Design a protein around this ligand. Structure first.
Ligand SMILES: NC(=O)c1ccc[n+]([C@@H]2O[C@H](COP(=O)([O-])OP(=O)(O)OC[C@H]3O[C@@H](n4cnc5c(N)ncnc54)[C@H](OP(=O)(O)O)[C@@H]3O)[C@@H](O)[C@H]2O)c1
Ligand SMILES: NC(=O)c1ccc[n+]([C@@H]2O[C@H](COP(=O)([O-])OP(=O)(O)OC[C@H]3O[C@@H](n4cnc5c(N)ncnc54)[C@H](O)[C@@H]3O)[C@@H](O)[C@H]2O)c1
Lengths: 174, 361, 366
């Protein structure tokens, strides 16, 4: 079921990759992990890896929640993409780096009609070669429902605080 | 079918229920799109921009609405009792989608019913995840939260950020946001990015985490807990800009800053009362006015979303588009609104000459 | 010795040449500090706060100035020709420090000369590194740069930052800063804070790296010179690709002893988007845009052209303590405590550079 991983694991997967899509959500905001996140993108772009950000229209708890924090962290606008711009790019991506997002990626929005988030559009993060979730536990999100992708074969869970874990990933990279 | 969008007639309303992008999508769905001459001028949308997008221009409101099967507006249509009978301009049997205020304006609901008009009150959109894209309350109040900070910064005689200079150091502004819904959160974000030290308070306890997720500090205390009012006052006395956003539908706005509280604020302070149309979170506020009392500016602008009309209009238009889109057939040129759809049953107030919504029947 | 600070009486002037902090410093130097009643109201500085800092409160401007050995003001005193004769309120032989505008206002200079008043023009502060603490031009224009963005945002019918939302994406505003001196740098920084995409241009080469370090992008084409018509065509050409996409244009460019350079012509505003805003911070010097008018917002071709006068006074409660500290830093190295007198060293560059007249004789070569 749950394939748990560490900062050391995430470091080589993304450095061996040639394309990484970062998926920020509410947990990123709670931990104030944006500065460590952009720092991680910088050490990736220097390595030759092309990095992007996939922003769900309702990530976080307000409109533009991810935008203001990414802007605070000096993330350039040309790396930042809305759901409809970037949903077809997961196929060509080696890694979907999902940091503090959950409902935003949950496939039960397409499947389960009794799901609270049914009909809501989502980011098809599973189409990436590898998906890594950063969150503290196996707890649900705002919708209060489980996510099928945590048990999927191409998913690695990275349990920890979003700021703490991402800081360690930058340290595990050189 | 023909869909029509008139100019907003209510004083100070600069928004329009259309954008060039939404025109493009509507024509693609098989609609003839008609817009009244000069309807988008307050929203920085020219007649040429809408003709380029595929819309026809009508020279008057009556001509725009004459043969329209669907009508899109921002605010509720005016009645004969208000001196300008806009509902009479709308074709009998047609579909109206707008911000109605249906639960507080029964006369317009009755006036639409007399013409057998099917009206959908967009403010009554159910709070479900798939209808977030259709929610006009959240799209407009979010910009109002941003705008509250801009208006506050404009009326304030100091700069928002801290500045370290050869001449000396000027401190940052201190901001206190009362009520942490959509508007309150965007005010926190905007105040914060401008460099202010931001505090917030809200009666709900799940708010603390949301405030902190934007770098704001939540006001806490650590039987009769009115040490809370003490903890709020302690911060309010140091506050440069207080933004109040607390709103209760159908009811008067709760009083969060009394006149006694205002007297204890420092001179040059500014209160932005976003609840001023519902009585205000501050009694000293007056609709459409900046009042000055006890050295404090009490700012009470009406229709704050219309102060961001050029960004507010495309979002309002997208909300309507998203609401209407799942009901267009285009195998026959018909708009078949589905009754088991929760967004349809939740927003429909009257149809085929009869009031439908349970709160108004 | 007595130091007095009256209320600013010129229309729209909300600043004051004092703060509680500076009062204490003057008291500790050995001055008696007198402030006119209600002088700090526009700057949010109460009579009680100055009193608590150790100042006396005089009921009128005349009563404040009557026995004052030194006088601090923001703007130049009004002459009898302008209405109320403020120069006549100042005691004979006294010292005056303010933004005098001596090079463009000779009548006030001669009026101070007739009353034997020693006048120091703070705007003529020499451009040396050690005089930055006493530089009123940079302290005030820094805040004007900030305020331009705030005025821009207020007049603008759109939001500054990018917001991705359930109702679609709100795009970021595009800001173009013309002239990257002190005001321009703060304009870039404040627009950037609000989430705008910021472009900038200037004739000085050292500016490019300053724009980039603030996260702005430079448009390739001390103070500046008059570039001429040849360069103006090439500047407008390179600028136009961005200017047609620009939401807020902030123009800050000046040239000493000359009218402000034309940077956005009426033909250029014709090509701008409807709802766009131009903030002409050079409007008092003739403007970088010919359509701007002092103290007015002009609307033409779908574009708001904003030309507020006295932009520092639109931030009066920050401007005032900074202006008062500029004055303090200029005056402090010349206070002879243990003798409690003011001996302004004539050998000092800052004294010789700013002194316009003393003891009934005009000193500055102008
Ligand atoms: N944006 C809006 O305007 C808006 C409006 C209202 C509601 N919503 C709703 O909120 C949801 C937002 O989607 P989302 O992707 O942000 O999913 P989410 O439902 O907010 O999930 C957030 C995830 O972050 C984790 N987390 C919390 N604190 C953390 C920390 N310090 N470090 C690391 N992880 C942390 C949580 O798991 P752990 O506890 O296990 O770490 C949780 O699974 C949507 O369902 C949307 O409909 C949004
Ligand atoms: N405030 C001062 O008096 C002062 C003191 C010491 C050093 N300096 C240095 O000199 C610089 C000038 O700052 P300022 O605010 O005094 O300048 P300023 O107020 O004289 O003018 C603002 C800017 O406009 C530019 N400019 C003029 N004509 C132009 C044209 N046709 N096109 C484009 N740009 C044009 C100038 O190069 C200048 O940077 C500062 O960066 C500062 O570091 C200034």
């Amino acid at each position: 079921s749950v394939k748990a991983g560490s900062a050391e694991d995430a470091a080589f997967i993304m450095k061996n990759a040639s394309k990484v899509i970062i998926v920020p959500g509410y947990g990123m905001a709670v931990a104030q992990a944006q500065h460590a996140l952009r720092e991680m993108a910088d050490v990736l772009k220097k390595e030759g890896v092309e990095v992007s950000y996939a922003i769900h229209p309702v990530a976080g708890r307000m409109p533009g929640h991810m935008n203001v924090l990414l802007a605070e962290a000096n993330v350039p606008y040309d790396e930042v993409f809305e759901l409809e711009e970037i949903n077809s790019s997961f196929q060509t991506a080696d890694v979907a780096f999902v940091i503090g997002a959950n409902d935003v990626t949950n496939p039960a929005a397409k499947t389960d009609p009794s799901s609270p988030i049914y009909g809501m559009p989502i980011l098809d993060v599973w189409k990436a070669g590898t998906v890594l979730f950063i969150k503290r536990s196996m707890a649900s999100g705002y919708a209060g429902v489980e996510n099928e992708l945590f048990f999927r074969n191409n998913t690695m869970m990275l349990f920890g605080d979003a700021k703490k874990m991402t800081e360690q990933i930058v340290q595990a990279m050189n | 079918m023909k869909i029509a969008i008139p100019k907003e007639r209510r004083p100070g309303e600069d928004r329009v229920a259309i954008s060039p992008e939404v025109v493009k999508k509507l024509v693609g769905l098989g609609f003839e799109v008609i817009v009244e001459q000069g309807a988008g001028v307050g929203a920085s949308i020219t007649d040429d921009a809408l003709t380029a997008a595929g819309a026809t221009i009508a020279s008057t409101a009556a001509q725009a609405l004459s043969q329209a099967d669907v009508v899109w507006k921002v605010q509720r249509p005016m009645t004969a009792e208000e001196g300008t009978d806009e509902v009479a301009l709308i074709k009998e049997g047609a579909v109206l989608m707008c911000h109605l205020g249906a639960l507080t304006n029964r006369p317009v609901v009755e006036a639409l019913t007399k013409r057998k008009i099917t009206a959908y009150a967009m403010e009554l959109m159910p709070r479900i995840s798939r209808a977030q894209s259709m929610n006009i309350l959240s799209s407009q109040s979010n910009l109002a939260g941003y705008r509250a900070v801009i208006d506050g910064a404009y009326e304030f005689a100091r700069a928002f950020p801290m500045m370290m200079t050869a001449a000396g150091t000027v401190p940052p502004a201190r901001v206190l946001v009362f009520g942490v819904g959509v508007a309150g959160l965007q005010a926190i974000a905007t105040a914060k990015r401008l460099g202010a030290v931001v505090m917030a308070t809200d009666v709900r306890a799940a708010t603390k985490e949301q405030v902190e997720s934007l770098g704001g500090k939540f006001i806490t205390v650590d039987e009769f807990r009115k040490k809370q009012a003490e903890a709020v006052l302690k911060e309010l006395v140091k506050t440069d800009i207080a933004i109040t956003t607390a709103l209760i539908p159908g009811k008067p706005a709760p009083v969060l800053i009394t006149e006694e509280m205002v007297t204890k604020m420092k001179p040059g302070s500014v209160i932005i009362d976003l609840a001023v149309e519902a009585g205000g979170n501050c009694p000293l506020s007056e609709p459409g006015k900046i009042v000055v009392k006890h050295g404090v500016k009490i700012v009470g602008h009406t229709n704050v979303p219309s102060r961001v009309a050029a960004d507010a209009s495309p979002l309002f238009a997208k909300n309507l588009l998203n609401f209407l889109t799942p009901h267009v057939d285009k195998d026959t040129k018909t708009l078949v609104m589905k009754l088991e759809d929760e967004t349809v049953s939740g927003t429909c107030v009257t149809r085929d000459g009869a009031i439908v919504h349970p709160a108004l029947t």
